[model samples]
Target chain A: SDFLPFSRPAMGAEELAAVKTVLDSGWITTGPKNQELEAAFCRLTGNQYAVAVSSATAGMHIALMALGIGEGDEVITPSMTWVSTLNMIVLLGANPVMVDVDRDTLMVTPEHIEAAITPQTKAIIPVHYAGAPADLDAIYALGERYGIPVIEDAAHATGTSYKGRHIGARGTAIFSFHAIANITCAEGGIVVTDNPQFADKLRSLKFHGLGAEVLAPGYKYNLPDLNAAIALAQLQKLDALNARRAAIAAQYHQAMADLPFQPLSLPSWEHIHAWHLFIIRVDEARCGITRDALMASLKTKGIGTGLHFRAAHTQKYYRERFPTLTLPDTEWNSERICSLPLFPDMTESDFDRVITALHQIAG
Target chain B: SDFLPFSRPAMGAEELAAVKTVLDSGWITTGPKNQELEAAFCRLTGNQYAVAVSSATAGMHIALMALGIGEGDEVITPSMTWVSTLNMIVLLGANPVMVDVDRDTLMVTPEHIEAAITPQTKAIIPVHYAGAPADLDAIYALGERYGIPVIEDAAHATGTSYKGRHIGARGTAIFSFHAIANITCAEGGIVVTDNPQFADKLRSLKFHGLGAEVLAPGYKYNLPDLNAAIALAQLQKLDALNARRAAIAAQYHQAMADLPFQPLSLPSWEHIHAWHLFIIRVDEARCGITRDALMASLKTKGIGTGLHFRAAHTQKYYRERFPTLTLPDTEWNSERICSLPLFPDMTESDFDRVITALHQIAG
Candidate 1:
């Protein structure tokens, strides 16, 4: 069994030193180091404030909680994502109005979001899939038109930019720093925004509601100093990291050009795609095996793969909650999509190996 | 003005080395190391399962979330501790029936809890205050009589036992591993339980509802491996660390016995106390200052202190929500109680300085 891997974070000596510094500081929880990271993120994105939390899911939940959106309210979002997006809505007792994604990039478009909005729709969450930014400009316009706040679920879009502006520059952005995410903070997220009022609310909400020294009752959704310290180190070198990831994706793209799997493409619009994942959709009739079977084969051969996502609306919780959530495009894509090995550490040889393995399995 | 360092954790080489191990492994979040720490905690508490979470607030939130205690329900608990306890109830759309604490220890008694139960009562949250264990047997008896579950908020009661049984041994319990807790994990917590069914649900809920390859909609309450690894190292020396804390508490108990401020004592029935904080009730009239002023005074003198809490029922959020709620005992203890410096590394000379400062201010 050859050891070909998918998505391993490239942590070097510098990141290790950062983590060591936090550990030796005698205070490893939410402290000065986290404050520094949040401040740094604000500077990086031109966002007025940044609130670091344990994970992007925590950021989403706290954001919803801060907005006082629950019960009778509804949130519109894409169906093609991890369960966390929908899970957050349910946790707050709100309905998740999931809509379909575009066929090309699997990111929700403005039309999809606008159609899903209703009188109950209080918010919209447009997720940037595979480090590709959602149609945020249009989404923001939609939000303005409907007078609803929009939150960017940039879980995959670390260092991603749309129209020369960072994904975190506008709207409320929740970026994942999970171990396997585009930018690895181990497990953390930050809500970035220019809205001073929302920023204050998020800060008040992120910590255990320690607003104005009042034990304001909110849950703890803070990024520990340890996680922040390492993430800050990585964030400093994010451009280089994403560049390497893109290079690996390019190699995969070239190798699989003639295969039965159709490669996912970047949109014609000018944007910095992080290339966090290289997803290939296999037509079962053409590829001769199911995505599940392909994954099993890869695992047996010591190759790791990932499910970029299954359609969230298809999940039991979502299905039961949103019976009318019809995401035809996302539903069709979920059955065929399989993410191949792609990361900074992956080599050209690794891409070739993946290509060979796929052809061999299909044959 | 001298710096007022309120509640600083002292972790050095050992904690750093443990964190370095996780950083080196590149498995930073909710992986092998977190599971290892959970195993260590289970062994320590003699519990069947221990699920680590982002914070003690998250630990309690998920515990309640797992019980499906929401909207239309009420949870009974003390209103003298942190506002998080009250907030958790409010967030769930449940009413927080406030109870008064014993004047001496500032802990809710069995009678206080029993008096608050109503037809809407669904759960009992018995918070172990300042490392002092509440009357668990009495609370359990009340729960049995009412057929409601009792959730022990053991945030401060780590390393403290009740009737020779560990806090996690008998009931559903959530404990903090925050920097200031008996065992430091920087910013993390764990829900320990003997019941496997509850434990499974908690673990799934902690990680955004992902269970055994199937994704469910849940929150990001999971504690990262990096923090847990540090906690595991700290867990090995927990007994020794707690013993050191106990010695400092014993000294404070003797030194402050004749002072205007008084230390709370464990009931005669209990032998073990974690001494998470050395809380002292200052008669404002005797001190000739408010709690805030004394804190300010202590800060000016290069000493730091913390308000263990103001009364929870008195907090703006709680007050607005429960305008008619009153707990006479909690109100009497809330205004005067504050915590002085208490940790494993405090020098004997520092203790002498604190006593001298107290005498100068109060006498």
Candidate 2:
């Protein structure tokens, strides 16, 4: 029996050869490859600068540090996103003023951000959930009005676009290259920013706070050359890799149009979705089956599925932290969201297998 | 025409293949390889538990956090070692109480530790500089007396021994596997501890702070499987690599016994050095030439050298923080310590070239 994973990295001889070159270079820790990868990221994202870091989580952490967000500060983010978003704020001794997401797009809007902002609000982190671009225009406008920095958690928006521009080309953005992302470097991230001063601060903040002057100790979040080499090769293949992902997503959209589950709807804006994940909301009552039961039945057919995410506020830790806070939309989506198998190199047969399995189990 | 680097990793076919297996497996993030590497570390170090982290800095950061060291607390560490030793303390908002190192050994002794302890002292981090063991018995005794945790910064002592036992065998320790260490995973480290509770905390602290119960957010310090794969292969070759390094160190010692510069002196205690670095103090007065001039002359002859470290307190940032603090021994070693070319893969000609180059420049 062949098993299909919910997600897998698209790698080839090019990635392997790139890694081998790094190994043979006798300098595999952060060096030339890292610089080259950063250059590639800048070019691809249309940004002036890009700093390669250990992970999207690390990139976000340093971004906040560079912005001087710490104790007594309040940063606004969404409960619809990953736990790391809230964790980063908590790690800094900052209060994470979490808001809700749109039920349809699963993205936090500028309205939610505006409502959550207080005098202590130091920064705003808007996650482009499931590869759909967030309302960047409104978010950036809000940030400008409040004089707060907008650090986009573009973990799922590597190839996503907004208003004919790349997601990371303008504002400060952090992109993830985890194994399950659209394009991966095993475990890596990049911070794209046009602000030279911020970029300089991030560089110092990512290393041991070794600036033009040693002001303080920073985190060791430098991306290894081995990971950078892979990232460079992966960057070159981004367009093609993302194209395949889009094609798969389109097919899934068409096949599941009449299904009881509701596929994630793209934002009502001019943008290109990265299609990093193809998640659908399965209401047990409407679908005549529970999400867990469907996942179990699919597993028996050698098909794997995943929970895209749980609401950050609903987690045991966050629940304990924000005992009285609740977001109905975030909780609603968290309970129903299920990610189907969708990767760049996923075969036509694999695609059909998932759809066929879903039709029989849930139809 | 040929250049000998101050240090290079001993990577081979095994390391390459292990990394290749990870890439081919499609699970390149933390997974099976990470677990296997941790198990190997426990077995090799004779520790009950070992948690592999992204870097030695990350390992130590989590170790302190696990011990509950925080703001207003003071941690005792050496000023004669790497800045990260102090940086980790500063990053956590804790005060790093600088202590002087032994003039010849470049290691902080028990006397230095006792002098620095105070009511605010929450933890003690004694670095085993240049692979030589620190006075563990004295350090641990002081820890018990003060009821503070004695966490060993074994960054330079991966394969070192103390009291006829491995450096990481019984107590708490953190070791580096950077490109220049006795063994390498490009950029990695591990925390070894006999306490299950500490290990549990470290495991949670390394990830996004996901624990059995979410008490707080942690860091994204998990070692990627790709790095762990290389680490596992390197672990298999650790003893052989360390033996070669030891042999090279002995050769350098015998050849330079009558030289002007003073090589580092081992302690009077019975222990085995890991020989991660072969440092020689170039006293300008004794050698009739400044260290920089000798380094330049050697560079012209296709030889390379490294300043092992400058005292942390002497750095611009630390200086600003501890303006009135001065340690004669630390400054003496800081200005003179130079690391020579020493790696396992160096050929006989490589050694001869370094020695011959040194003779021409400083003999």
Candidate 3:
């Protein structure tokens, strides 16, 4: 009925089978299956531990909590990303220091992060925007010099790698397994790290702090077995699914290369992109239509498009809370970026329809 | 394989069919299914509103958050529970001022709550121990005199009624729907209340401080559609399944009437106990065997049992935090209470085996 959806999950028989196994097993809340998912994630990311939770947002919050980035501290990140990144800082009574990003890539560079760092800076969060890995090496180096943790906002980097190493393996990466994510878990997330202590802390934090091992007052932030079972099944097919996504991205790259809309560029890093989202920058001056207008026209033609973000710092909440922030480049790109339909199992006809719709709207 | 373990869900083919539908329908996170389940819970609990969360502990934590009880506050609850009750309070940056319970019922009373209230006291949490509804009238009156909110820890009181009204409908009740719970969603929970403002706040707090109608930096505490699908299916059979539990509890009450181990007493209230759990107390002095010894004996006879709780304040962390705090009755009962196997699907032979194990353990 619809030509395309902005994002969609491809569920199969195997995923359904895993759900049945969990329903039958009855140990449904963060049990054996979660352990198994974590093990599998470790193998994929080379991270020593994978702490699964209810959402990527929770995973990120716990990562900050484990690091002890509490009140009167600063966390620096790109202004052009999901609202959760900034929200986490506010929730913890910490200051969110917004930084501008590369106009084309919309990724916070190491220079931007370094410039934002102050005596109060406690952590540097570099969000991997739209499957494009940020300048993590530079950010990590800055973190090292400043003696702060480099937390990777890898919500969009599940199947992505950085400099020949997977996103999750090197540092702290919180992976979102939301329905529209690279891998769907109905709704779930996980934190990947090489440290055992943080991993153990995450486990306790996710489960309402029952530290059966330590006996602390932890809140419940666990993934259900039913969701985990589906995640486990989805993980089994992630490589293949992501590969199909890669192929679709390549097709889009070929078709849209010469179009007026300037697309995001790949960094020279050796890591493979997850291609979770195939976002393109729509320049109204060159394309003859505003990004929002193009989106509306596509919707009329039964095509779906979405704004992955709209400058996190520009939001009323972020602006009010972080009054001294200025992220001009990121603010510009956030308004222009739009994510087109990209999923495994998407038919060629669907791609053709989207291309035609874009051309018609621009013309 | 091993007598199917304890407390396995008896799902019919129709339940499986409903899950398959949810899997096929790509909208697997918060959607109409979750809304439908909330409505169903409202009808079942007689509460005006219900907010579903990822776990019962979350429901409790958010309820406290909504009540504005946190740092420098003290809330009174039974020194006995699954540790979540104690842990939730601690997570809020407050101390859990645990009170003693009646040794036989292992449930807190009005006197215990009143005795524990201090100038810093913020609330009173009365749990429906072993599905036996707490003395709500007394507890409510006590809270009224102290001008405190009476939050009900209904983790074990899903279908229980107090004074002819569903326990959840009367106060701010948090119910657990964990896989092993009387009513389960694999792993899920809900907070039922009549206060619209509180319900709205819970909805926001449950998801990570998300403000109304916006995705704020909320925790990922939302129940997924997969869990809700199973929960919805289970609701249809709640009464029937609980009826089975009632019969099982009746058998335990009848068989253990003359034994040294005493059963939980049902006060003459016009309420129907859900019989979510059938708890039997061991008088270590008369029974000859310790409660743990009886548990071991029952396990050997293919009969499983559970420890309702040890005294919470006596746990390593709690005891260390509040060194001088003492609840003698809770400490005494913690060593004596053991919950025997109780579920709807247990055959008569299984019940007989349980009784035989108890008789042999006593001898």
Candidate 4:
């Protein structure tokens, strides 16, 4: 009597009310609400400034462009992260140094990141994979040593905290508020940075880059007030929303232990996870089910699943472009990893249903 | 107690209800509704394909990119259009041959377009300024003769038609659904093209250009379902919406004739108008007021006005880049052109108030 989708945005009265406020205001495109959202992110991240945009990718586009990652520049990022990271680098006429991730955390190691760096490396992007914080101190140390800018891909770590501070509190980071994220805004994001110059570049880039004059040519990446309003509402409930997500992931961790589905390992660092996605690796040899096989079977039990990402270098464009490129850990995990149902509104029964289906598929 | 902005969106119950439906569905990003919107545009414009994107500027960027207008390429466009059009060309590594527009219609002529053409010419962008067609037959013939692609900037022509056919029905064009446009979803747009190959490139360019394989890097310009659903509702009311704009323009045409604020001349052609903007040239010699002076005076009377655009070539980046570039028609109009208050739900007395304010200011 139940079918659980992988994700569903918990759009409710509070969010709808914010939207109505925007619709009633008559000024619906990028305006005051975007300013509010930028302020909101600055408050959340404790960064000096923030610039809200149409999406995290839009943030990445400008962030990369702003840093001058043009032709012949190389940007080091993990292959396990979303393909857009790779795409953004490529689109800016820069090369993507696709590095392998740790097999368990699905996050890049500073060792791997450092190995990929060359004189051409303009930037280093480290993802907060599946809501867990990456080893930022070590990564930032690498950035400082090499004089390379670090852009934290905090798309999954909206409510996450690393050590004594929130992610992006002291450095530059782009956070997403897409429908499936811990923060839901239909489609939106904010880039926060302690560097005022970087923040100014982001704000300028989001619009047509007009400096009351034409400073530079920019994309129309400005987030609409209609979207910014909803994101602001979501930001208000961030702690509680992430708390609900944490609760569900907690159950999956404890209860699903008996099942052969190998879930992602928590990072051995002092951090608070936001639990954006509860992922499991289904190994054919170890679990008696392939990831693709388990995903199809989950559907038979009225359950849904997702592949967080496939290796970017293995994708046709990058694969064909760099035939010799191989990231073994990323390739292995990319094939086996699956995102189980995890949302703020996921009911207790829904969690049990997914758990039951996974166990059944294992047998 | 009396103030009116130059433009406001008529975001009413219908649009709000559409948004509510999308939120309730829990699938708020790009999905069925974007497809529905793409389908709806295909119906309205009789185009073979449509790709819904975040903004007209987004469409322009991708359309220019898809045509491979990279370094050493020249794209001919007018200086009178929004600066974003100029920005998009420069951002894509193409040279923008900023042409002049017709003095009366505020549109680039085929002769001016031809003059700008060179061996390096990759594409031509013609704006549908203030909701009128830009001499399509002659323009298309020129495009065919020179083998240069014509990308129509149909930002102001949502319900516009030329010679019994919608602007994008036969050729390629990008339409805006920005807050102030005829059919709006706060900030949205669509690129419609009859060429299947070009449509494929646009479809690829909008969403990180991910095919089953990664075909190319793309921008995250995809319109969200939350925005698209609202636009679908707007599409259903396009005729009534445009008629409302038409009636307002009609009144301004007859009533404001005696005023020195010379309204835009209607094109001497058989076509339907959407009246997205009602522009007037404030000639200081005749009206005893500069455009800047007129704007400030009108605001003092609790009435707002807008400069539709300032000359792009006169802007800092483009000006410094192409120092000698000048268009007498564009320069003259750029100093004087102002957009008056226009929207579907603007009250009759609202119209009277604007007229009264203008008369008093002139006196």
Candidate 5:
């Protein structure tokens, strides 16, 4: 029972009491709490608008829809991220044009994005991977030049910042408060944007697509007050909790410096990192073991490891559907990246346990 | 303010503590509690399968997709229900062929359903209107005859039964646990059925459509463990809660016996009503005031009322799209119906106050 999960929520009395209050209030569906959470998130992120939704996946799906991305349209996204992005594009009858990520940062660069642009490319979704802020300025510039909108999948960037600004402050960004994120609402997300018109469209899209005198067809993706209550409490402690995550990640950085595995490279610009996941890429040639072998070895010693992600284009469904697309860097990084134990509540001993196991297995 | 809303959830310490427990535990998103809630629902309804979702709307959307309902397909549904039924059908790129409800019960009859059937009719969504079970035996017979599936919108029929069998005991049914329903999970729902294959498809459909080897695009509709914890507790007390609702409805029926307003007629067959709402049709010709005027008058007295619904085909979007279709009975009932304050926590004085107001308004 010494097993340590790669990720777990940091929750306690505040979250429990807040949730209890919602349960006792009797108006627990989308109500005052959801509004309050949205307000709090806007204040924290310095965004003009923040609309809470069921999940980051839901947020991205609707955000794309709100941006008028649909059939015969093409959306540019990195292949080295979660499948939800691809799923959203595919579900909407649009094509997800794949872009490769930087091998060091595991993030899509502006160059990669610019190459994927075509006449049909209606939107670009640059995911902030492993809590590292993607190069937003360049991506935004590309979007503006091409007359396309940028929707940041900030699912890993709740507390992430780019060039000293909050990720959601200036652009259209969707942040996850899923259980395993830096801040959590059990299962919730928010789409933050500066445009009033887009924000209005997102609001309408979230609540069954209500228009001024019409019943528009939409999805049921509203964030419930029960989750909102928990999120409100989580938001209050996010900075402090994220600091703890940073400390743990720093420890991993120092401890694994001499190991054969390579950790994600820090951003060259000044920014605040969320450190949602402390990931390392194994080099089978230098480490004398394969990534899967390393994961199994850690597991045998009661340590849980996570595969940050597999390349979206490599998935059976996507591979068959888009057979012509080849993303070499995406496949190369995806095969090596593994997430180590990293949560706000992990003890020093828990960190030591994982570090010691890795040292014993690879050193 | 002596305000009494038309519907409210009856929650207490047990539900509060259950949600607190989920919060205190790290696994707050879809986990063991969601699975347990699904099992409890199956046991309560005598169903072979139950898949928890974000809302009844989500359940219906996926259920239709699982049945392969899409563009060029026609779905038959009553015009007297909520807009979600029509939204699901339209959102899936299908045509929603309308059927009118019976004047007395405000539910669709088999004759009405049969008349709307066409070669393109792929599914029939018969809603259990206002907690009263629809004529399922006849509808199922029709479904069997035509080889089309019947998906029940049991949003208001959690405790409803037909011929002594629970509404979700056998056929495919989707139940809502929204805040205003008989039982609540803040905002949650479930799809229940007897067929394992359909159940499997639904399960896959709810959680981003992940099967063994293929990743299919799906909605982010899985019920979180936090809401599931509340739902599991609510399910335990549902019978008692529903009984109270029925008792209140019976009281209203007796008190308004001499009034011009007419309550819903009892079903001809032996059945158990959930009594989710106590609705009456205000005959302006006899009651001396319109339904909206009555609602406004009640609001002035610190009492609240609700319009159960307006007909689907009468909405601006639907009206414009389906200009040729006319549902006379649906419009007639929609214009006259109003919901009075009804919840399990209503004290004798609360009920008396509403009843006394009704007496003054109509007597």
Candidate 6:
């Protein structure tokens, strides 16, 4: 009866009170709360402006459109991340150039990005993978060197930072506030940028295309205060909750060393992890069971796990469209990676439940 | 203390409790609450399938995308409606053919749709007006007549009906649960259809296009249970709220007769009025006050008024793109038609506040 989900939104009286206040105010959708949440992101990321949207996919779409990513253009990103980004690219009639990530950390590096660029490449999207920031300096350097605008996918790293500053700070990036985000509003996102002109265009795009340049083919993806209020409440607890995640993740990371399972290796650099997901690769050769089989056993034990993502290139349409395209590490991780239960409110017993089950299944 | 909104969302303990329950239960985004709300719409609209989304605009975007409305395709719709739909049509690389509405009723007819049809026309969008249903039988007949898909724009008419069934029951339709709707979720929408395949495609599009068909450029427009919960709570009060609005509006419709103003005429059809808005045209020729001037006057008197919309064809982008295009009645209504205060709890005092000002200025 008490099945632990792989990720449950950690809601408390803080977020609850905020939503109740929003409901009572009768100005629930995109009012003072949206402004308050957007402002908080600017302060957190040190970005010049932020546009709150219904989802990060919509945020990415408008950011891409703002930069004029269209037909005949290419966007370089890792297939190790969410397929939502790839969908936005194709939906806008552009090609997504899928690249490989560091097999251990699951974050793409400069070498991977530089190799994937071509003359037609219009956007360089380096995703800050699972709680860890990507190599932003080298990644942005490559974008500048190649004259391609970089749109940092900061969806997975809200509490993450590199070299003493938040990942999106001093950079243009998109962040998600989805149900699973470090700071969630159930379903919402933010795009932070230092570009004033770009920022104004995005503001118009979020509404009915009736702002700065009102004629743009903008969409209505405005995040309502009902959701924004929760994000604000979550933002207040961002630090403490992230610290809890670190502790829980540490227990898993350290304890799992004796098992055949391999926790994602941390990047060897000055950074703060968002601890977004507690993912481990269960290689069949060493683990005695496949990832799916491990997950199945966990389910039978009333423990939930998830595949953070299936490789994009290996998906149905992607496989059919890019038959010859291959990224060995993405495919490898795609098959073996399993995300264990992890959230701010995921209890100590819940952590024990996963660790005990993994030991019984594979150790 | 001295003002009234053209419309204010009426919230109570019911909606507040729903949000509170959703917050406590960790599964917030697109979970059981979303399923329940979708089922509720299915039962309400008599449609077999309903896909809950972040907004009706998102719903419209995917529904159009599902039907394959693209470059060189033309969509027929009334310019008297919200510009958001036109923005969607333009964003999709499809051309929207602006059609005029019946001058008094502000609703399009079979002739309007029939005349706008061309070899390149891919779809027809007929909007049910403020308080009444469009001649859906005639509109759907035209869709069947030419093989073009008919998407009923029923965003303005939640409880409105044609003959005995709800507006979208026998048709494919889009409905908004914006804060301003009869039944609101602050920000959400539903697309209900009897066409199972189209419904499945919509379900896929709402998520990351991983349902029924997996590879289409889908979007992340799914409605979270947080928003969905509000709609479900509001849905329970839909009939009660509409009845209150009808009573409040009837008082205005009957009271404003002696003034030099014109209330919108109802359609002479067997239908149910949704009472979405109470519109009045402060004709400059008759009332000696322009709609804008009248609204400003009402504002000074502590009563709020709003233009339901400015004509899309008259908007700068649409104007620049379609300069020679003109719909006489649309521009006329665009310059007139003020939506008076209308809400479930808009008391008799508030009603007196609006009526006293109208008569004082123009009687």
Off by more than 4 A, model 3:
A211-214, B1-4, B211-217
Please, what are the lDDT tens digits per residue for candidate 6 over residues B1-363?
567888889899998899888888887888999899989988998888898989999889999989889999999999888887898899999998999998889999888789889989999998888968988888888888899999988898899988988987876889999898898999889998989999989999888899523566688889999889989999999999999998988898788777888988898889989999989887899998889888888898888887887888887798899889978888888789889999998988888888888888884
- Supply candidate 4's per-residue lDDT for B122: 91
- Model 5 clash count equals 0
lDDT of 2 by residue, B1-363 (tens): 578888889878998899888888888999999888889888888999999999998999999989888889999998887788788888888999999989999989899999888999999888888899998988889999988888898999988998899999978999998988888888899999999999999999899888633466888999999899998898888889989999999999988976788899998899998998899988988887888788888888888888878788988888998899989999988888889989999888999898887777674
- lDDT (Cα, 0-100) at A346 in candidate 3: 90
Candidate 4 residue lDDT tens string, A206-275 = 8888767778877789889999999989889889988999888889889767888788998999999999
**Candidate achieving the largest lDDT:** 4
Where does model 2 exceed 4 Å of error? Answer: B212-215
Give the B-chain TM-score of model 2.
Answer: 0.98
Q: What is the DockQ (computed on Cα atoms) for candidate 5?
A: 0.73
How many residue pairs clash in all the candidates, one count each? Answer: 0, 2, 11, 0, 0, 1
- How high is the DockQ of candidate 6? 0.74
Candidate 2 lDDT by residue in tens digits, A57-156: 9999999988888889999998888788788899889999989889989998788899888899999999888888999999999999999899999999
- Candidate achieving higher DockQ, 1 or 6: 6
lDDT winner, 1 or 4: 4
lDDT per residue for candidate 1 within A197-279, as digits (tens), equals 88888888877687744546677787778788888888888898899888887777776766777877686688988887888
What i-RMS does every model get?
2.4, 1.7, 2.7, 1.0, 1.7, 1.8
Per-residue alpha-carbon lDDT of candidate 5 for residues B198-255, written as tens digits (9 for 90 to 100)? 9988888787677733467776788889888888888889889988998998889888
Minimal lDDT window, size 10, model 5 chain A: A211-220
Q: What TM-score does candidate 5 reach?
A: 0.98
| Model 5: per-residue Cα lDDT over A1-363, one tens digit each | 557888889888898888778777777888899899888878988998889999999999889988888889999999888878888898888998999999889889899999889999999988888888888889889988989889999999988989989989888999998888998988899999999999888888887788643456777799988888888998999899999999988888888777888998987877888999888888898888988999999989989888878888888888898899888888888888899999999999898888788889875
Candidate 1's C-alpha runs over 4 A off are A212-216, A323-325, B1-6, B212-216, B285-290
Candidate 6, overall lDDT? 0.88
